[PDB]
Design an enzyme around this catalytic site. Structure first.
Site, PDB file in Angstrom:
ATOM      1  N   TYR A  58      39.166  35.264  44.644  1.00 55.58           N
ATOM      2  CA  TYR A  58      39.029  36.866  45.220  1.00 55.58           C
ATOM      3  C   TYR A  58      38.393  36.605  46.500  1.00 55.58           C
ATOM      4  O   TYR A  58      38.602  37.788  47.296  1.00 55.58           O
ATOM      5  CB  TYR A  58      38.338  37.683  44.359  1.00 55.58           C
ATOM      6  N   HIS A  60      48.789  43.216  41.893  1.00 57.00           N
ATOM      7  CA  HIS A  60      48.256  44.533  41.936  1.00 57.00           C
ATOM      8  C   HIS A  60      48.449  45.291  43.085  1.00 57.00           C
ATOM      9  O   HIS A  60      47.463  46.171  43.639  1.00 57.00           O
ATOM     10  CB  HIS A  60      46.480  44.459  41.636  1.00 57.00           C
ATOM     11  N   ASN A 112      41.551  44.875  33.239  1.00 62.30           N
ATOM     12  CA  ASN A 112      42.772  45.528  32.966  1.00 62.30           C
ATOM     13  C   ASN A 112      42.778  46.721  31.822  1.00 62.30           C
ATOM     14  O   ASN A 112      41.742  46.781  31.361  1.00 62.30           O
ATOM     15  CB  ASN A 112      43.871  44.301  32.369  1.00 62.30           C
ATOM     16  N   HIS A 148      36.034  41.998  43.317  1.00 62.06           N
ATOM     17  CA  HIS A 148      36.280  40.450  43.194  1.00 62.06           C
ATOM     18  C   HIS A 148      35.157  40.202  41.816  1.00 62.06           C
ATOM     19  O   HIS A 148      34.079  40.676  41.980  1.00 62.06           O
ATOM     20  CB  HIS A 148      35.976  39.717  44.251  1.00 62.06           C
TER      21      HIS A 148
HETATM   22  C1  HDD Z   1      42.903  32.848  39.929  1.00 65.86           C
HETATM   23  C2  HDD Z   1      43.655  33.782  40.359  1.00 65.86           C
HETATM   24  C3  HDD Z   1      43.543  34.803  39.330  1.00 65.86           C
HETATM   25  C4  HDD Z   1      43.820  35.036  38.178  1.00 65.86           C
HETATM   26  C5  HDD Z   1      43.592  34.047  36.955  1.00 65.86           C
HETATM   27  C6  HDD Z   1      43.539  36.523  37.929  1.00 65.86           C
HETATM   28  N1  HDD Z   1      43.377  37.215  39.097  1.00 65.86           N
HETATM   29 FE1  HDD Z   1      43.148  39.124  39.278  1.00 65.86          FE
HETATM   30  N2  HDD Z   1      43.373  39.131  41.388  1.00 65.86           N
HETATM   31  C7  HDD Z   1      43.508  37.685  42.157  1.00 65.86           C
HETATM   32  C8  HDD Z   1      43.816  36.614  41.618  1.00 65.86           C
HETATM   33  C9  HDD Z   1      43.432  36.186  40.205  1.00 65.86           C
HETATM   34  C10 HDD Z   1      43.954  37.979  43.467  1.00 65.86           C
HETATM   35  C11 HDD Z   1      44.855  37.092  44.341  1.00 65.86           C
HETATM   36  O1  HDD Z   1      42.518  37.481  44.183  1.00 65.86           O
HETATM   37  C12 HDD Z   1      43.710  39.611  43.840  1.00 65.86           C
HETATM   38  C13 HDD Z   1      44.766  40.295  44.754  1.00 65.86           C
HETATM   39  C14 HDD Z   1      44.251  40.290  46.144  1.00 65.86           C
HETATM   40  C15 HDD Z   1      42.601  40.820  45.874  1.00 65.86           C
HETATM   41  O2  HDD Z   1      42.115  41.304  46.588  1.00 65.86           O
HETATM   42  O3  HDD Z   1      42.526  40.045  44.551  1.00 65.86           O
HETATM   43  C16 HDD Z   1      43.649  39.888  42.374  1.00 65.86           C
HETATM   44  C17 HDD Z   1      43.754  41.405  42.048  1.00 65.86           C
HETATM   45  C18 HDD Z   1      43.487  42.086  40.698  1.00 65.86           C
HETATM   46  C19 HDD Z   1      43.037  43.460  40.666  1.00 65.86           C
HETATM   47  C20 HDD Z   1      43.329  44.544  41.625  1.00 65.86           C
HETATM   48  C21 HDD Z   1      41.908  44.992  42.070  1.00 65.86           C
HETATM   49  C22 HDD Z   1      42.076  45.959  43.043  1.00 65.86           C
HETATM   50  O4  HDD Z   1      42.406  47.120  42.705  1.00 65.86           O
HETATM   51  O5  HDD Z   1      42.135  45.579  44.418  1.00 65.86           O
HETATM   52  C23 HDD Z   1      42.753  43.639  39.208  1.00 65.86           C
HETATM   53  C24 HDD Z   1      42.492  44.703  38.556  1.00 65.86           C
HETATM   54  C25 HDD Z   1      42.813  41.982  38.555  1.00 65.86           C
HETATM   55  N3  HDD Z   1      43.158  41.286  39.736  1.00 65.86           N
HETATM   56  C26 HDD Z   1      42.473  42.090  37.294  1.00 65.86           C
HETATM   57  C27 HDD Z   1      42.620  40.575  36.602  1.00 65.86           C
HETATM   58  C28 HDD Z   1      42.276  40.486  35.322  1.00 65.86           C
HETATM   59  C29 HDD Z   1      41.786  41.281  34.316  1.00 65.86           C
HETATM   60  C30 HDD Z   1      42.538  39.041  35.049  1.00 65.86           C
HETATM   61  C31 HDD Z   1      42.600  38.259  33.945  1.00 65.86           C
HETATM   62  C32 HDD Z   1      41.341  38.355  32.841  1.00 65.86           C
HETATM   63  C33 HDD Z   1      42.994  38.431  36.193  1.00 65.86           C
HETATM   64  N4  HDD Z   1      42.770  39.503  37.308  1.00 65.86           N
HETATM   65  C34 HDD Z   1      43.410  37.085  36.752  1.00 65.86           C
END
Ligand code: HDD
Ligand code: HDD
Lengths: 726, 726
Positions: free
Chosen positions: B388, B101, B174, B365
């Protein structure tokens, strides 16, 4: 075992044309292409086949599909160290992108000089025609982020890391011979003005917005490189078909201590070629990775990018003999005044193995010179020297970025520097300081000499007071823009006018557009009038009366400033779309494909669906892509063989394919009943220059098509295309 | 003074339609729009007017145009601290982008519930309909970098930070109601597969490549969200016109300690609407910032994005009552089974001031919950809780990321944590540990209770052994993709077939395409056959005999899964192109603009050049853009008013503008002699639904056009567009 039993998952380790096989890491695609830098990276290359999956601490993992939980529907436990190691590494994969040139594509290769240049420079890598120096080259755009598109209108970077026996030399150039600004103190202003605007972060990869043109209108020093960017120089066909330049005057220093001023050039052996704006812009959507893809595939096909290094050399005594200052990076040195002397050839012949490790982490910096070279007081170059070491401290995480494998010298390096984050080298020297007695003062300083000597700066005389002042010899802004304008063909001048017109149309504050037009009127009234007409702006009588700037040293044009005025076409490595039907004349396709192969031109067989079609004679034709899937934007010419034309004649995608290729000035060849498509593009019965047509693809059909491809585009078609609804 | 004397450099601080004024920072465009969070950022907002330019140490700069040198053509001196400060700050501007994202666009706003939810939750922000909670929302794509394009095919993020009186709650969702994978341990595998391939870092912003389809083919749990991504859900028209979902089952906990399962929903009050693929892909080249721009401009216009928060609620005793597991994030809960209960409204009504400071550095987060909410053992959510917080240590430079202004709570926060990089808060507490007597143990723990209590986790029973095992109840992969497929209209189904066909055509290794078609045969044979036919694949007899998966708890369809099966169109904030000519009939334009204004629809006046044209009555009309500069891709409908139609009748770009709008199923309205353009798009005299035509633009003509625009696109035209060469 999930691989197909036929082994078709794995590309052949031999040269193959674009699209014939999946692309792969360079050491797997071309394991026998070697050079001293590629071989030196063997200590860090990691394979995979036949090895167990482990943690980073070497523990074998049994189940890489699940977290450890209490119960199969229970909560994840903190003690799952395999999960946390894997997610932690993921969570910290990204590093800051480069502040500028964040979007770039790179390859390994080698350079060799044609003859020893010992008479003019003691640089070891230019001392002997048998001395091969490995290189790593990154080509780039300037404004957009690492995830922006390749075929935007922008300047391109052209950065070459030479791994010499006396040190790394980085020649960090662009694809135009001047820069926008004169003094490095203005670089953050200029860059901030061209980058996405700070409230909303728009636009990406585009100079077409208010703040860029506001700065240009207020800083006429920018106009010369703005002329280049608005020409078709700003939209190259390929990194293989653009020129490179170091921009600044540097020095060569020979063993007798004589300094010669030098400007560096790269000539593309594939020739110069650019897109047209509507194609470039649409290609940013249909394939934002087009240049990255084309470079990688050319190298996989053996169509190695080759460039000739050349020097413009000016004796110390001739520093002041031109109408412009040699130290002013907004001025070029016309080749009519000072010719480029051929120096040696660089061939890029292997892709990286891992883009992040080798491309993303490479650090190029123009302060990385070697004995035999030196700087000048160009005030843009002088500030660059500060920036490229400083920026790596955040980008690459500290002062040990030269220990990242791609950045390592292949020659020896030994000194008293210690520690820093990520320290790899374990020094055994008892001493960490000099002068020391405890290690007999090793490693030791080395006096300068003719070869393998220490670096000593040329003893240039400095005299002046400490001032923040621009030299008055830099205060001339319009004569070089005008020399560039007058050197372009009539169609290049049209594309310049259309560049300015399109970009200024996106500037929302009209007064900015007006101020830019006023600057254009100081360069050339025809240019200014044509842009003004497209913007609905009428020049004032004062504007109509601005006297043109002077000629540059008597020149009123220099054809080496044009992409196209002097024919330098090369069709090898170019590609043609072949629009198939469901019963292709096989004799046409034999003749077409073998003619293309003979000249190293690639083909892509297109149809309305994937799979195969069958020719009149039973030959099974495999389909590469559909008409919409591989648009005419991605090819250099289009051939429609004879057969059952009714199969595709009412296919809107097939018709539009020809309309788009026709608009973008591409050669189109139509055999037999494919001439029924003449009506789609409105071609007269008696035909027109740029459309090849015959009863079949035999005789001179493919030679005529190839002649057109060697001239790149059908410029004479330009007045015919305004009416085309495409 | 460099500003124009007329003040036209500065946009009005009032709501203005897109294009009427240059866009600006939120606090300057809408200074009177406030909320508690926006106010709290006043400590760090910095103006500029009337202030002197200084170093960051507060030293006034006299000459910001030049470096300090020894003589005006001499070398730059190391003692130039002004130059080095300025260039050092530039050199370290970039921070790592988000791992996923990275491309996103954000705005400030506020939420309030419709009624108290105290019976089901003790969360303070849901307790009182008149207690407003500020929010900051970021919408995003998933795969591409921060500089990638907006209108790619991808899932979209929808992340909302609620600044509550009892802590920050982040609902990190999402635009589809499920994810691709079941256990967080696989997230790096799935993300690596969808991201640019590691050798050459291609493709950007596209799942259309071999590794993503390889992973899909080998992990059928992905197929449900792959169905959603290949449908037009993958290409929304705007962030205003998509749904949001939290995906996971969470818990609500009331004051009595009762747990209710909940899944979160956002309903867009502007309605659901998406692009079509050819338009979305070409838009990534013509305006890669289209959604960022449309969001910023809707807020500047007063078309604030509004969304209704909704809960699906399931009692604890009904955990196992469905044929899928509630904790499986690849399964959705059909609204026919469990209705969405409306909870409250969120309105986004101010854009940020500085995109980097407020959008790039925002950290959301899903582990940031508050009392009254809790987690479940969904094994994807469980591992998200680790990532997060971990990822911000590199992205945002350390553990004090909550002190970056956009991330600060507006409620109190006090604890014994200390130091860390760029520590802002200066703690005066004599104690930095508890229990302590030296500060009488402050700050103190707080027991849980009905309001303002400490957080305590719901005492869920855990019974099981320590295992890395997937719940058997998660091992069903085809019934939800089938329910989705069966719930789409026939045109939506055609678009899904086309999305799979287009993508798989780009997979170089044919066996991968074959394996994905075999998965599709397990979902629906009609889908599988239609995709196979486009790929030139024939299904085997065994494939033709695969038994379809079971209905979902007796459902054969759920129309809430369709974008379009139930009308919910809202034209306010949409935009029409008006194609001008040099003698426009002022009576048409009057009628057009009146009717548009009544329904809140914006207009953009286009012509073949910029500047102005004069209508029949002397009205001077300023031109927003050229036909090429603002293509039909960027608007919802096209109107051509009467006047001197011969002016534009043979203009290629004007005719193409109508062919492109027509291909992309947009309404087109042609007044008077503009009906001569009917020939370009082959409409018979008797007319065609979707093309509005009359002798003049009157009330009737506009009502018809507006009715069409409320239905978004003209689906019935689909059979007529295969033959249009555009
Ligand atoms: C175990 C790791 C993991 C998994 C399984 C997911 N994500 Fe995530 N997500 C991340 C690890 C992550 C991250 C690496 O922690 C991010 C990117 C950097 C940040 O600040 O967060 C992230 C960013 C991120 C953002 C952007 C937030 C922003 O605008 O800064 C959204 C909307 C989502 N995720 C949504 C989801 C949804 C709806 C998931 C499944 C239901 C999901 N993520 C599974
Ligand atoms: C004073 C600052 C400054 C100025 C005046 C310039 N640059 Fe620069 N340039 C940078 C500061 C910088 C930088 C911040 O140091 C970059 C980005 C990150 C990096 O490693 O270097 C960089 C990157 C960079 C790259 C990309 C190297 C790569 O592929 O990694 C190229 C090709 C150039 N620049 C070329 C130029 C040319 C031809 C210039 C004018 C003649 C120019 N730069 C002026």
């Amino acid at each position: 075992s999930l691989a197909p039993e036929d082994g078709s998952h794995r590309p052949a380790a031999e040269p193959t044309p674009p699209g014939a096989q999946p692309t792969a890491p360079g050491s797997l695609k071309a394991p026998d292409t070697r050079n001293e830098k590629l071989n030196s990276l063997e200590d860090v290359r990691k394979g995979s086949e036949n090895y167990a999956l482990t943690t980073n601490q070497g523990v074998r993992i049994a189940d890489d599909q699940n977290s450890l939980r209490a119960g199969s529907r229970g909560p994840t436990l903190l003690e799952d160290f395999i999960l946390r190691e894997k997610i932690t590494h993921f969570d910290h994969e990204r590093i800051p992108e480069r502040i500028v040139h964040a979007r770039g594509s790179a390859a390994h290769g080698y350079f060799q000089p044609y003859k020893s240049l010992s008479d003019i420079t003691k640089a070891d890598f230019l001392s002997d025609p048998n001395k091969i120096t490995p290189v790593f080259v990154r080509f780039s755009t300037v404004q957009g982020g690492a995830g922006s598109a390749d075929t935007v209108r922008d300047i391109r970077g052209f950065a070459t890391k030479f791994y010499t026996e006396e040190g790394i030399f980085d020649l960090v150039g662009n694809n135009t011979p001047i820069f926008f600004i004169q003094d490095a103190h203005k670089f953050p202003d200029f860059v901030h003005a061209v980058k996405p605007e700070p409230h909303w972060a728009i636009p990406q990869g585009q100079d077409a917005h208010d703040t860029f043109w506001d700065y240009v209108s207020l800083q006429p020093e920018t106009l010369h490189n703005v002329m280049w960017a608005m020409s078709d120089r700003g939209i190259p066909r390929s990194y293989r078909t653009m020129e490179g330049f170091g921009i600044h005057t540097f020095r060569l220093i020979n063993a007798e201590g004589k300094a010669t001023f030098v400007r560096f050039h790269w000539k593309p052996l594939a020739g110069k070629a650019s897109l047209v704006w509507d194609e470039a812009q649409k290609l940013t959507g249909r394939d934002p990775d087009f240049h990255r893809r084309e470079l990688w595939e050319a190298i996989e096909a053996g169509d190695f990018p080759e460039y000739e290094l050349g020097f413009q050399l000016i004796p110390e005594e001739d520093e002041f003999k031109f109408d412009f200052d040699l130290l002013d990076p907004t001025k070029l040195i016309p080749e009519e005044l000072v010719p480029v002397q051929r120096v040696g050839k660089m061939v890029l012949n292997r892709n990286p193995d891992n883009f992040f490790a080798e491309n993303e982490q490479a650090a190029f910096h123009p302060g990385h010179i070697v004995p035999g070279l030196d700087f000048t007081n160009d005030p843009l170059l002088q500030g660059r020297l500060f920036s490229y070491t400083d920026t790596q401290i955040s980008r690459l995480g500290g002062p040990n970025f030269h220990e990242i494998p791609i950045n390592r010298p292949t020659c020896p390096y030994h000194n008293f520097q210690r520690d820093g984050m990520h320290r790899m080298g374990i020094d055994t020297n008892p001493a960490n300081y000099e002068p020391n007695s405890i290690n007999d003062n090793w490693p030791r300083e080395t006096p300068p000499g003719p070869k393998r000597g220490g670096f000593e700066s040329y003893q240039e005389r400095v005299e002046g007071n400490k001032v923040r002042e621009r030299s008055p010899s830099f205060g001339e802004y319009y004569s070089h823009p005008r020399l560039f304008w007058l050197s372009q063909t009539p169609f290049e001048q049209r594309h310049i006018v259309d560049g300015f017109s399109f970009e200024l149309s996106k500037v929302v504050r009209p007064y900015i557009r007006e101020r830019v037009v006023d600057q254009l009127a100081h360069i050339d009234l025809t240019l200014a009038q044509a842009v003004a007409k497209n913007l609905g702006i009428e020049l004032t009588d004062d504007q109509l009366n601005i006297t043109p700037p002077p000629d540059v040293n008597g020149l009123k044009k220099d054809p080496s400033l044009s992409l196209y005025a002097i024919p330098d076409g090369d069709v090898k490595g170019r590609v043609v779309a072949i629009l198939l039907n469901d019963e292709v004349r096989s004799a046409d396709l034999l003749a077409i494909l073998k003619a293309l192969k003979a000249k190293g031109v690639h083909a892509k067989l297109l149809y309305s669906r994937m799979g195969e079609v069958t020719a009149d004679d039973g030959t099974v034709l495999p389909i590469a892509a559909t008409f919409a899937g591989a648009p005419s934007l991605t090819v250099d010419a289009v051939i429609v063989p004879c057969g059952n034309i009714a199969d595709i004649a009412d296919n809107g995608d097939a018709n539009y394919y020809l309309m788009e290729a026709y608009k973008h000035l591409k050669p189109i060849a139509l055999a037999g009943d494919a001439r029924k498509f003449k009506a789609t593009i409105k071609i007269a019965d008696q035909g027109e220059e740029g459309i090849v047509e015959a009863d079949s693809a035999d005789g001179s059909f493919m030679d005529e098509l190839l002649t057109l491809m060697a001239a790149h585009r059908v410029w004479s078609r330009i007045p015919k295309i305004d009416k085309i609804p495409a």
